Amino acid sequence: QHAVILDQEKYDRILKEVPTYRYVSVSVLVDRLKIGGSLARIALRHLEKEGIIKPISKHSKQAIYTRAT
Amino acid sequence: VLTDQNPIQVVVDAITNTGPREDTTRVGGGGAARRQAVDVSPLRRVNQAIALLTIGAREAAFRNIKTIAETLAEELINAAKGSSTSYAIKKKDELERVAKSNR
Amino acid sequence: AVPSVQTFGKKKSATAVAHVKAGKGLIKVNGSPITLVEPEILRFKVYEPLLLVGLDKFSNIDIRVRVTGGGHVSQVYAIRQAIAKGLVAYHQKYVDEQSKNELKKAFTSYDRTLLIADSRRPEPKKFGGKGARSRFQKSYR
Amino acid sequence: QIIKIRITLTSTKVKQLENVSSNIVKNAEQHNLVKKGPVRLPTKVLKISTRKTPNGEGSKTWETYEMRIHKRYIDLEAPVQIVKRITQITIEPGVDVEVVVASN
Amino acid sequence: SLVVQEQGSFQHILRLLNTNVDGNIKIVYALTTIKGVGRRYSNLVCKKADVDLHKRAGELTQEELERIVQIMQNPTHYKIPAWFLNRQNDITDGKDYHTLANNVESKLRDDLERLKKIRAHRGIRHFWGLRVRGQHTKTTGRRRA
Amino acid sequence: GRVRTKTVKRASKALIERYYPKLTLDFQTNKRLCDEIATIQSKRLRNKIAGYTTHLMKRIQKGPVRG
Amino acid sequence: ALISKKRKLVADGVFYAELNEFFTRELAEEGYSGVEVRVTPTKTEVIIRATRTQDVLGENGRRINELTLLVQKRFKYAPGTIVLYAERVQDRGLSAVAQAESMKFKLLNGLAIRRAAYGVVRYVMESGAKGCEVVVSGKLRAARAKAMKFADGFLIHSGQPVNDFIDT
Amino acid sequence: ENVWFSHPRRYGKGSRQCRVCSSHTGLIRKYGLNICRQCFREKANDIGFNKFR
Amino acid sequence: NEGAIRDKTAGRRNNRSKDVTDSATTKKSNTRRATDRHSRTGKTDTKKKVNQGW
Amino acid sequence: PGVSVRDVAAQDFINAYASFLQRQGKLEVPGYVDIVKTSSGNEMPPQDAEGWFYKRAASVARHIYMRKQVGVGKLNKLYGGAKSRGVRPYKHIDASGSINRKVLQALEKIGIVEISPKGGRRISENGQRDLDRIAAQTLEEDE
RNA sequence: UAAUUGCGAUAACGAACGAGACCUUAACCUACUAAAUAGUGGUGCUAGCAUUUGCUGGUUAUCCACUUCUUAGAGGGACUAUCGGUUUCAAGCCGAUGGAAGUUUGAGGCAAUAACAGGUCUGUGAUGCCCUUAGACGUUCUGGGCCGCACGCGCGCUACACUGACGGAGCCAGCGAGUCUAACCUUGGCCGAGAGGUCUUGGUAAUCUUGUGAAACUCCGUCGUGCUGGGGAUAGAGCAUUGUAAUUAUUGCUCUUCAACGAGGAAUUCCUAGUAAGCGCAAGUCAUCAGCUUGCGUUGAUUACGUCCCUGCCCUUUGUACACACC
Ligand SMILES: [Mg+2]
Ligand SMILES: [Mg+2]
Ligand SMILES: [Mg+2]
Ligand SMILES: [Mg+2]
Ligand SMILES: [Mg+2]
Ligand SMILES: [Mg+2]
Ligand SMILES: [Mg+2]
Ligand SMILES: [Mg+2]
Ligand SMILES: [Mg+2]
Ligand SMILES: [Mg+2]
Ligand SMILES: [Mg+2]
Ligand SMILES: [Mg+2]
Ligand SMILES: [Mg+2]
Ligand SMILES: [Mg+2]
Ligand SMILES: [Mg+2]
Ligand SMILES: [Mg+2]
Ligand SMILES: [Mg+2]
Ligand SMILES: [Mg+2]
Ligand SMILES: [Mg+2]
Ligand SMILES: [Mg+2]
Ligand SMILES: [Mg+2]
Ligand SMILES: [Mg+2]
Ligand SMILES: [Mg+2]
Ligand SMILES: [Mg+2]
Ligand SMILES: [Mg+2]
Ligand SMILES: [Mg+2]
Ligand SMILES: [Mg+2]
Ligand SMILES: [Mg+2]
Ligand SMILES: [Mg+2]
Ligand SMILES: [Mg+2]
Ligand SMILES: [Mg+2]
Ligand SMILES: [Mg+2]
Ligand SMILES: [Mg+2]
Ligand SMILES: [Mg+2]
Ligand SMILES: [Mg+2]
Ligand SMILES: [Mg+2]
Ligand SMILES: [Mg+2]
Ligand SMILES: [Mg+2]
Ligand SMILES: [Zn+2]
């Protein structure tokens, strides 16, 4: 199964990985680790708070995201 | 995001690479019927390329959560420099492999 | 009397009425700024009349537009046609005719109907099916 | 003794109601009453759709019959005779004519 | 931003009302697994229970689980109105109940047995296994089972 | 598609027969000529006639016609 | 009073239809070809067109008085609010209704087929029509039935002309 | 003279009929026509209903 | 009803156990097309009859 | 140099006005507000039970402002959507009357709207001020 | 050529019906004639934001002006126009330009000579004949039935979901109908979660319902591939509406119940541009009842511009012992 809550090992996984990927979206987070995709979305607005992730586009169907800087 | 380049430059490349160069028609054939190898118009190469790619993206994204936009890019990027992991690249190569046979 | 002009444009049953008078250069559709038109992704379709001829041309004229009938896409094409058609009918009257023809020729070179109404209208549904050409399914044996 | 009069004409045949309107239009401003010319009201089309077949059989064939109703009105200002004259002088079969005092 | 970790505080597969709830899902939807609670009743229940609905069921400390339950079996006393309740103005007892878990199966049979004891046409149709409401049986409902 | 009937090709052969000095290579004028030297019952027929005769006249000035 | 104009004109057209039939059943022996209704303020006018006019307007105004009274009672007209008239006809040889009634009256009177159908086609021709068609269907005798098409002269069956110049 | 001979006639078919032929079947009530569609095509001319299209 | 509800047999599962008569999957059988032109009355007519009336 | 609510996009405005009337604290959100679907054609209650009534109240404010007057029956039809009939085809169904009627009533208590003649409800000079004032705030907030 | 539509060839010449013309409808008209039952600008009066004059409104007539949008009269407009490429140098086809429109401009109405034992005697106070006619096959009343369910088959509606569902929010049609000696189309207020109730109102209607604020659709959020929040069958309980009458559930509403269905075998239907398909709306019926139909608009394509391979149909030739014509 996927993961609907953070393990704090999964929280560490996030910040020490996501800057690696040039493309990040709802699906990239779900496939690359495992995430409920509802908590991929919560990961995306949070990863954006202090950017390791820079939005070039957002939308209700799709979120498009780029490497830190 | 993935390739830089021009996102429109690669769809062009994808459409050029996924048009079947020669194709096959169904001959009368006397009951069980022989297939003849014929070359295909450049308008059909554009028509059929666009079909293959969208169909490719339509099938992938169905019961995958991934969006059509992401699968189309996955389809189009792979087809741009042909990966053979793209749906349209695979179909073209098979359509040309059959043409090379039944002539 | 003021120097006004009144033009219209149509796509399907949508019909947009344009008021072009000399003025400060506000461009409004349905009493609302043309920047807030939200058929959304279509927004440049109503931006196009302005970006072809240049943005400076509207500094001397106010644009009021109001639409009725049709649907959310067809009203986009009825206001973009009444905006491009009011620009020339203001230049036909109140400025020189060789300028009007540079307006028209920049429009028609790129045009998507732009000043010339799209004549496609809906076909009627004939008995025996769900549409003009669509027939109900048959059986035989 | 000038009144403010409303004449309303409704009929199914255009060419009889057009020249009853034009006979009210000419005679009224011939001797100069006001004008308020004919206001054409959208022609109402009464549609009826039935099956061509009695009973039920054959291709399912649909005929649709039309009756077309055309209305217009004209407003005159004048007293006494030219009231009861203009009503009863301009008249015609199949053309329905009614005249209203004013408003209410 | 609800981003959070915990340790042992999240628990998968807890149990209430003699049923096993999925320990991973949102609580409004995790609770609907219980017979008698649908999406609209589970939803109103969490609301009177001072439960943050943004939580998975694997959150929700045992206190909060006990609150959901009491409310669940005493809706009429929590301001939940009578029209939100699946068994109203009973027949015999006459009061406003909301039946839950294995009792839904029970009381359903009771009702069925009732007009079967009374031999009203509707229980007759139940007994045979025909369609109870007024539908045509000619063309439809084949393959039976 | 577009093919002109005998009732149209017969008015066009009949007019040009009598009226050749009066007709032209321009549709618009001959249309008006048709109201003068012909009585034609509907506007479309008149337009359709004149449109053919001129097509005849046009190729008459090119060479002679069997018609 | 107070009807809708959409409903009133419809109710008027029904009034033409039911009246037209009644005179066809009642005035059949007098050669009734049709009617016109004239609505004027105070006195609606009804005009009867029948080839035998004197049998329509009967002895010293009677029987057109029977017919008005019947109309009055029927449609709830106050006495005098409706009036019946009589015309002779315009060229009965040019009327569809007239010849069909003429044919019915020839067969029923003991004539035979071709002579009656050729008789009527010739009268319509000598009355100056462009063309004439008489079609007798049914069993003119003896079990299986056929159709007979008698015609002469000129007829167009197709366009809006069928509405203008031909009546059936 | 005696009640017992009738039952409510107020609505539904069977309070209706074609004012010509009395059939309750497939009446045309629109615009208060109240003719059955089988007689309605016979009289459609005299009523002034014609087919232009 | 007390009769009906009590009745074994006429309940549902019983109908479900019985196999379905071959007349359910049957054809309509069309029953006399090919005689349609031939007149079955056997009377016919006579040129003297066909003549007087026509 | 002056602003009307027609100068602010539909969603950004009803957003910042429905988070204004929740801050304001005087609305009179009705006693149910948690158990209602807003439509007999809906399925589930609104997903935001906290601020949905202020979301709708800010909608009805911006919607009556742009028009002469509008009544309850017109808000219902405006907010009523497509109803799934299940195995039967969809059709439009009007929204809840008590919701909207209690929005017009509660809006009358802050004076954002008033009884109009002709019938219905019309925007009030005071409420024309408050909408225009926050129309500028949202506009000026984005600088 | 869509056409026996024509060009031609010619023991034929000249013609008629059908085709075409015709009519209706949908496109254009800043040209004509007008309009508070259609609109638009100005002026009054008046709201709010701004201070720069301005922006956005309100006022059914405060008053003036106009006809661009709307309505429908009369006209105008296309004729395949113009040039070019083909061909018998014929009718025509093809290209480009211009045009509101160049597929018979789109789509319809009408529609020849003959034919069928096609359907309809259950539309008809159309009808020949036979049948029945007072224990009626007349007619009415009560109730039941037409819906009865192991199953075979046709037209369909809803789906399998992420190009989605759910929640907010944005918010745009056209064709339509509608109350008199009487219950219609119904705004507005109030009540009710709902459905509904209620007090009033406008409209016999370009006037009021109605801008039918329709749905798909758009935006923001929630759910996250799990028969899951996809699907909504079956069923339990309660509340309303129509009706003399709702049981065998009329319909609607509420909570619960949460099935098959994971793209459908062999077969097989419809379709070429505002069309296919998606989407809702009005009208018919209708006391109540649409999963039906007749129309309407909204969103809006992929593919063809062909052939006789398949399935029909026609024409010519041909054969016949058929002509009641291969039943
Ligand atoms: Mg409209
Ligand atoms: Mg029948
Ligand atoms: Mg449950
Ligand atoms: Mg059924
Ligand atoms: Mg079965
Ligand atoms: Mg000749
Ligand atoms: Mg002809
Ligand atoms: Mg024709
Ligand atoms: Mg009775
Ligand atoms: Mg809406
Ligand atoms: Mg909505
Ligand atoms: Mg559904
Ligand atoms: Mg030929
Ligand atoms: Mg001829
Ligand atoms: Mg014209
Ligand atoms: Mg062009
Ligand atoms: Mg045509
Ligand atoms: Mg025919
Ligand atoms: Mg038979
Ligand atoms: Mg019959
Ligand atoms: Mg029957
Ligand atoms: Mg039946
Ligand atoms: Mg039954
Ligand atoms: Mg069928
Ligand atoms: Mg939605
Ligand atoms: Mg009300
Ligand atoms: Mg209550
Ligand atoms: Mg109006
Ligand atoms: Mg209206
Ligand atoms: Mg489910
Ligand atoms: Mg659902
Ligand atoms: Mg029953
Ligand atoms: Mg019940
Ligand atoms: Mg087929
Ligand atoms: Mg029913
Ligand atoms: Mg209906
Ligand atoms: Mg039906
Ligand atoms: Mg030949
Ligand atoms: Zn009848």
Cα distances from J37 to residues B87, C3, F5, J90, J94, in angstroms, run: 45, 54, 69, 18, 12
Q: Is C20 helix (H, G, I), strand (E, B) or coil?
A: strand
Six-digit token string for C1: 């009397």
- HSE of F15, CA atoms in CB hemisphere, 13 A: 29
Beta-bridge partners for D47: D66
Residues of D in contact with H50 (CB under 8 A): 65-67
- The total of other beta-carbon atoms located within 10 Å of residue I17's CB is 7
Convert E5-38 to b/e letters by CB count within 10 Å (16 or more is b): eeeeebeeeeebbeeebbbbbbbbbbbbbbbbbe
Cβ–Cβ under 8 Å, residues C7 and C82? yes
Dist. CA A46–CA A38, nearest whole Å: 13
Cα H23 to ligand 39 centre (Å)? 6
Cβ–Cβ under 8 Å, residues D45 and D12? no
Beta-bridge partners for D6: D75, D100
Query: Residue A56 carries which DSSP code?
Result: E
Dist. CA E50–CA A66, nearest whole Å: 40
Convert D25-36 to b/e letters by CB count within 10 Å (16 or more is b): bebbeeeebeeb
Dist. CA D13–CA D94, nearest whole Å: 7
Cα-Cα-Cα-Cα dihedral sign, residues G50, G52, G56, G57: positive
Nucleotide K233, nearest residue via CA and C1'? J87
Interface check for A68 against chain B (CB to CB < 8 A): the answer is no
Cβ–Cβ under 8 Å, residues B68 and B55? no
Residues of E in contact with J34 (CB under 8 A): 44, 47
User: Would you tell me which residues 6-45 of chain H have a C-beta closer than 8 angstroms to some C-beta of chain D?
Assistant: 28, 30-31, 33, 37-38, 40-41, 44
Q: Which residue has the tokens 């950017």?
A: A51
Name the nearest CA neighbour of E99 among E8, E49, E54, E38: E38
Cα distances from C74 to residues C52, C78, C124, in angstroms, run: 21, 6, 19
Q: Phi/psi class of residue E89: alpha, beta or left (left: φ > 0; alpha: ψ in -120 to 50)?
A: left
What sections of chain E are H helices per DSSP? Answer: 27-31, 39-48, 62-73, 102-118, 121-128
Beta-bridge partners for D8: D73, D98
Name the nearest CA neighbour of C90 among C118, C53, C117, C119: C53
Dist. CA E57–CA E75, nearest whole Å: 21
Query: Residue J71: what are its φ and ψ, rounded to 5°?
Result: -100, -175
Six-digit token string for B48: 């059929």
Contact E129 I2 (CB under 8 A): no
- The total of other beta-carbon atoms located within 10 Å of residue G31's CB is 22
Q: Which ligand is nearest to the CA of C69?
A: 1
Chain centroid offset of residue F1 CA: 20
Does H45 appear as a known binding residue? no
Nucleotide K254, nearest residue via CA and C1'? E83
Dist. CA H4–CA G99, nearest whole Å: 53
Nucleotides in chain K near protein beta carbons (<7 Å): 1-3, 5-8, 16-28, 30, 33-37, 40-42, 47-52, 54-59, 68-74, 76-83, 89-94, 100-101, 103-126, 140-142, 147-159, 161-164, 166-181, 186-196, 204-206, 210-211, 213-226, 228-239, 243-245, 247-258, 262, 269-281, 283-288, 290-300, 302-304, 309, 324-325, 327
Beta-bridge partners for D100: D6
Query: Residue D47: what are its φ and ψ, rounded to 5°?
Result: -105, 140
Which parts of chain B are beta strand (E)? 22-26, 35-39
Q: What angle do CA G99, G102, G103 make, to 5 degrees?
A: 90
Q: Which ligand is nearest to the CA of G155?
A: 7
- HSE of C41, CA atoms in CB hemisphere, 13 A: 2
Between strands C32-33 and D5-11, the pairing is unpaired
Residues of A in contact with E25 (CB under 8 A): 4
Dist. CA D96–CA G41, nearest whole Å: 10
Dist. CA H37–CA D63, nearest whole Å: 11
Chain centroid offset of residue J95 CA: 13
Contact A4 E24 (CB under 8 A): yes
Question: Which structural domain, as residue segments, surrounds residue H34?
Answer: 1-53
Residue H29, amino acid: R
Domain boundary assignment for chain F: 6-61
Choose from G16, G35, G39 for mutation: most chain D CBs within 10 A: G39
Contact G17 H43 (CB under 8 A): yes
Which chains contact J through at least 3 pairs of Cβ atoms less than 8 Å apart?
C, E
- HSE of C67, CA atoms in CB hemisphere, 13 A: 27
Cα J86 to ligand 35 centre (Å)? 20
Residues of E in contact with J44 (CB under 8 A): 39-40, 43
Domain boundary assignment for chain C: 1-141
Cβ–Cβ under 8 Å, residues A68 and A15? no
Q: What is the CA radius of gyration of chain G?
A: 19
Dist. CA C24–CA C7, nearest whole Å: 19
Chain centroid offset of residue G108 CA: 18
Cβ–Cβ under 8 Å, residues E16 and E65? yes
| Angstrom distance, B49 CA to K304 C1' | 18
What sections of chain G are H helices per DSSP? Answer: 5-26, 64-75, 96-108, 113-126, 161-165
Cβ–Cβ under 8 Å, residues J90 and J82? yes
Q: Across chain B, how many H-helices and E-strands are there?
A: 4, 2
Query: Residue E58 carries which DSSP code?
Result: T
Distance from the Cα of H52 to chain D's closest Cα (Å) equals 7
* Method in brief: X-ray
Q: Is G38 helix (H, G, I), strand (E, B) or coil?
A: strand
Name the nearest CA neighbour of G69 among G82, G58, G56: G82
Does H39 appear as a known binding residue? yes
- Maximum Cα–Cα distance for chain C, whole Å? 76
Dist. CA F33–CA F19, nearest whole Å: 10
Cβ within 8 Å of residue E126, ≥6 positions away = E112, E115, E116, E132
Residue F6, amino acid: K
Six-digit token string for J114: 């008033």
| Angstrom distance, C118 CA to K96 C1' | 21
Question: Which structural domain, as residue segments, surrounds residue G61?
Answer: 7-84
Cα-Cα-Cα-Cα dihedral sign, residues G88, G93, G97, G98: positive
Measured in residues, chain H has a length of: 53
Dist. CA E3–CA A6, nearest whole Å: 7
Q: Which ligand is nearest to the CA of E115?
A: 33
| Angstrom distance, E83 CA to K167 C1' | 23
Query: Residue G58 carries which DSSP code?
Result: -
**Which of H19, H20, H48 is opposite residue G13, by nearest beta carbon?**
H48
Six-digit token string for F3: 């093919």
Cβ–Cβ under 8 Å, residues B21 and B45? yes
Between strands A53-57 and C14-22, the pairing is unpaired
Query: Residue D9: what are its φ and ψ, rounded to 5°?
Result: -115, 125
Q: Across chain H, how many H-helices and E-strands are there?
A: 1, 2
Cα distances from C40 to residues A65, C77, H47, J14, in angstroms, run: 22, 13, 53, 18
Helix, strand and coil in chain A, % to nearest 5: 40, 15, 45
Dist. CA E125–CA E130, nearest whole Å: 5
Number of independent structural domains in chain H? 1
The fold of the F6-61 domain, in CATH, is Diphtheria Toxin Repressor; domain 2 (1.10.60)
Beta-bridge partners for E56: E26
- HSE of I8, CA atoms in CB hemisphere, 13 A: 0
Q: Is G45 helix (H, G, I), strand (E, B) or coil?
A: strand
Query: Residue C29 carries which DSSP code?
Result: E
CATH number at residue G18: 3.30.300.20
Six-digit token string for E141: 């409902």
Name the nearest CA neighbour of J131 among J104, J106, J113, J143: J113
Six-digit token string for G79: 């006495």
Contact G16 H31 (CB under 8 A): no
Nucleotide K196, nearest residue via CA and C1'? J97
Q: Which residue has the tokens 């390791």?
A: A52
Six-digit token string for C18: 């344009």
**Which of B1, B2, B66 is opposite residue A27, by nearest beta carbon?**
B66
Cβ within 8 Å of residue J110, ≥6 positions away = J21, J24, J26, J27, J127
Name the nearest CA neighbour of C111 among C28, C52, C26, C31: C52
Please count the residue pairs, one from chain G and one from chain I, whose beta carbons lie less than 8 angstroms apart: 23
Dist. CA D3–CA D100, nearest whole Å: 10
Cβ within 8 Å of residue E5, ≥6 positions away = A5, A6, A7, A8, A10, A11
Cα distances from G156 to residues B46, G133, G134, in angstroms, run: 55, 11, 15
Interface check for H43 against chain G (CB to CB < 8 A): the answer is yes
Q: What is the 3-state secondary structure (H, E, C) of chain D?
A: CCCCEEEEEEECCHHHHHHHHHHHHHHHHHCCCCCCCCEEEEEEEEEEEEECCCCCCCCCCEEEEEEEEEEEEEEECCCHHHHHHHHHHCCCCCEEEEEECCCC
Residue J68, amino acid: K
Does H11 appear as a known binding residue? no
H or E element: which one contains C65? strand C61-68
- Maximum Cα–Cα distance for chain J, whole Å? 56
Does H18 appear as a known binding residue? yes
Six-digit token string for J74: 């017109």
Q: Which residue has the tokens 């449109």?
A: F51
Cβ–Cβ under 8 Å, residues G70 and G23? no
Cα-Cα-Cα-Cα dihedral sign, residues D24, D26, D31, D37: positive
Convert G114-151 to b/e letters by CB count within 10 Å (16 or more is b): eebbebbbebbeeeebeebbbebeeebebeeeeeeebe
Interface check for C130 against chain D (CB to CB < 8 A): the answer is no
Dist. CA A32–CA A24, nearest whole Å: 10
Nearest nucleic acid nucleotide to E124, CA to C1' distance = K248
Six-digit token string for J125: 């000079």
Between strands C4-11 and C32-33, the pairing is unpaired
Name the nearest CA neighbour of F8 among F64, F54, F61, F66: F54
Dist. CA E40–CA J35, nearest whole Å: 9
Residue H12, amino acid: G
Query: Residue B33 carries which DSSP code?
Result: -
Convert B40-68 to b/e letters by CB count within 10 Å (16 or more is b): beeeebeebbbebbbebbeebbeeeebbb
Angle of the J97-110 helix axis to the J52-65 helix axis, nearest 10: 70
Dist. CA B86–CA B55, nearest whole Å: 11
Residues of B in contact with A59 (CB under 8 A): none
Beta-bridge partners for D65: D48
Convert F3-36 to b/e letters by CB count within 10 Å (16 or more is b): eeeeebbebbeebbeebeeebeeebeebbebbee
Cβ–Cβ under 8 Å, residues F11 and F55? no
- The total of other beta-carbon atoms located within 10 Å of residue A59's CB is 8
